[PDB]
Amino acid sequence: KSRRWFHPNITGVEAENLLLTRGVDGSFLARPSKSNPGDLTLSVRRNGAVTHIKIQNTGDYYDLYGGEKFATLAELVQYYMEHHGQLKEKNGDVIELKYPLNCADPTSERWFHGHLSGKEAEKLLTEKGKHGSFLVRESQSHPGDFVLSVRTGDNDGKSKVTHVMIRCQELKYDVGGGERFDSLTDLVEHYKKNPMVETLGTVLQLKQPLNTTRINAAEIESRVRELSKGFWEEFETLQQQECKLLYSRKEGQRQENKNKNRYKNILPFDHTRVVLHDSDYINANIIMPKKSYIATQGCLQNTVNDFWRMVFQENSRVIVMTTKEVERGKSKCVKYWPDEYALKEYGVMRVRNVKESAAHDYTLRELKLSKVGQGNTERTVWQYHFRTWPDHGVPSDPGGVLDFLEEVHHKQESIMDAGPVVVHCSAGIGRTGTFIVIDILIDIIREKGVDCDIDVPKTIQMVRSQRSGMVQTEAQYRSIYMAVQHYIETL
Numbered sequence: 001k002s003r004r005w006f007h008p009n010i011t012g013v014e015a016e017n018l019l020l021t022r023g024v025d026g027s028f029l030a031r032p033s034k035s036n037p038g039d040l041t042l043s044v045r046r047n048g049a050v051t052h053i054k055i056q057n058t059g060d061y062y063d064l065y066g067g068e069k070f071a072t073l074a075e076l077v078q079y080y081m082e083h084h085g086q087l088k089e090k091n092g093d094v095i096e097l098k099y100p101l102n103c104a105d106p107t108s109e110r111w112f113h114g115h116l117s118g119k120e121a122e123k124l125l126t127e128k129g130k131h132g133s134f135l136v137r138e139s140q141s142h143p144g145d146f147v148l149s150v151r152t153g154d155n156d157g158k159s160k161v162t163h164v165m166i167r168c169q170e171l172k173y174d175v176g177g178g179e180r181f182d183s184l185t186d187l188v189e190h191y192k193k194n195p196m197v198e199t200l201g202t203v204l205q206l207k208q209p210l211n212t213t214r215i216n217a218a219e220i221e222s223r224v225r226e227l228s229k230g231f232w233e234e235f236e237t238l239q240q241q242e243c244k245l246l247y248s249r250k251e252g253q254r255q256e257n258k259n260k261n262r263y264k265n266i267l268p269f270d271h272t273r274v275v276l277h278d279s280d281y282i283n284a285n286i287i288m289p290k291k292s293y294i295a296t297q298g299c300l301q302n303t304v305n306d307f308w309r310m311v312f313q314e315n316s317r318v319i320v321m322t323t324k325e326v327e328r329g330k331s332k333c334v335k336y337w338p339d340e341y342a343l344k345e346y347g348v349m350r351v352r353n354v355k356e357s358a359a360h361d362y363t364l365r366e367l368k369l370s371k372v373g374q375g376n377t378e379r380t381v382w383q384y385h386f387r388t389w390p391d392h393g394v395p396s397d398p399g400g401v402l403d404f405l406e407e408v409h410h411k412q413e414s415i416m417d418a419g420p421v422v423v424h425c426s427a428g429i430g431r432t433g434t435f436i437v438i439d440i441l442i443d444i445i446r447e448k449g450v451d452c453d454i455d456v457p458k459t460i461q462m463v464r465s466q467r468s469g470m471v472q473t474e475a476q477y478r479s480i481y482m483a484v485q486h487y488i489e490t491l
């Protein structure tokens with residue numbers, strides 16, 4: 001599901017049009033809604049009419065109206081393309097997702113810039129680019145045409161930049177002869193597989209798009225200023241890449257494991273799932289960026305014992321909890337720790353709550369975890385329970401967030417051979433992914449100094465390849481920039 005079925009700037013009327021005139025029954029597209037930001041609409045054609053299904057994400061997962069909850073839009077679409085009869089209209093009424101109505105718009109492509117000059121394209125390609133780096137810009141010469149600028153090189157023996165005219169005639173694109181493509185993306189994909197060769201020998205390889213998101217950490221404030229009056233655009237360009245991350249989640253799908261998941265369709269990747277060698281399943285993934293994380297869901301009553309098996313096995317010594325046990329009347333996490341001073345056995349695992357320390361935003365619980373029957377397997381696990389995450393959106397004071405983050409960091413660093421830092425919320429991808437990504441970026445700055453490069457979208461995509469949908473919303477996306485900005489500007 002190459003997110004081509006996602007149309008980043010399109011009306012409801014435009015969508016109906018497109019489906020009726022360019023589609024058939026079973027055609028579908030996804031669009032960001034303008035009843036409200038953060039909400040998507042899945043527009044589907046059936047019986048010659050178009051229906052619109054709402055999809056909300058308030059930060060925890062994608063909530064399909066009248067359907068199930070999903071980690072990403074790609075994972076939602078993949079599910080319903082392989083599960084006909086499941087997507088229902090007004091009770092029972094099977095809506096079918098058959099044929100993705102693709103988008104011709106290049107706007108959210110990593111290689112598309114437009115509004116860009118030949119000499120400026122050269123600057124950027126010489127500044128940040130390498131061999132095979134490319135981009136497509138609008139032609140300032142003949143207005144409506146496009147230009148493909150490519151760095152050919154080799155250290156990577158710098159060398160050269162080439163510009164290839166792309167002509168646009170009767171709403172099709174070509175490079176001067178040969179095939180005429182319906183979209184810039186089709187042109188680029190075609191010459192990605194069939195590299196244009198120069199009359200003289202040079203092969204114009206399109207390897208990777210020009211990086212436009214990596215900044216110097218010291219300059220993040222200027223970047224944030226630039227984005228504050230286009231955060232949305234950089235987010236959508238990251239979203240479009242999630243189609244690359246549809247890895248298998250077989251184990252979480254097994255019958256014996258179904259009810260060990262808080263949300264049926266929000267599962268851990270097989271290739272990074274935490275495997276319990278002590279039945280072998282828990283809805284949790286190792287996140288490897290030296291400090292690593294386990295990103296996991298809040299306990300269900302029947303996974304409390306497996307959670308402590310995991311903490312013990314993985315030698316985790318710090319837990320970060322980013323949710324109340326219940327919010328808005330719903331249960332986000334069952335209490336998996338004893339009351340202060342109490343001792344409990346959770347299966348073969350025994351834990352005592354040694355002491356609780358209350359701060360304003362969080363409560364720290366000093367827990368001692370051992371295997372029942374085996375003294376001297378005991379270790380302290382420090383549960384940092386963050387209590388003040390708001391019901392809507394994200395924290396609005398970077399001070400307390402960064403105080404909490406710094407404390408959690410320094411606890412982990414003081415413990416010899418501590419294992420992954422366990423982080424969880426409700427589904428374990430939204431608030432969890434946001435914390436982890438911030439902590440990773442701030443770890444980069446804290447080690448390499450304020451002069452280092454950081455790349456926020458790239459770091460997120462790297463983490464999302466290890467667990468589905470890490471970082472859920474645009475609000476959380478912006479919050480990552482704000483947190484790193486504050487950290488930088490308090491140094």
Ligand SMILES: CCCCCCCCCCCC[N+](C)(C)C
Nearest residue numbers: 394395396398401435479482483
């Ligand atoms: C208006 C400025 C907004 C700044 C937002 C700061 C980051 C909020 C999300 C991370 C909180 C992680 N946490 C709380 C668990 C440590």
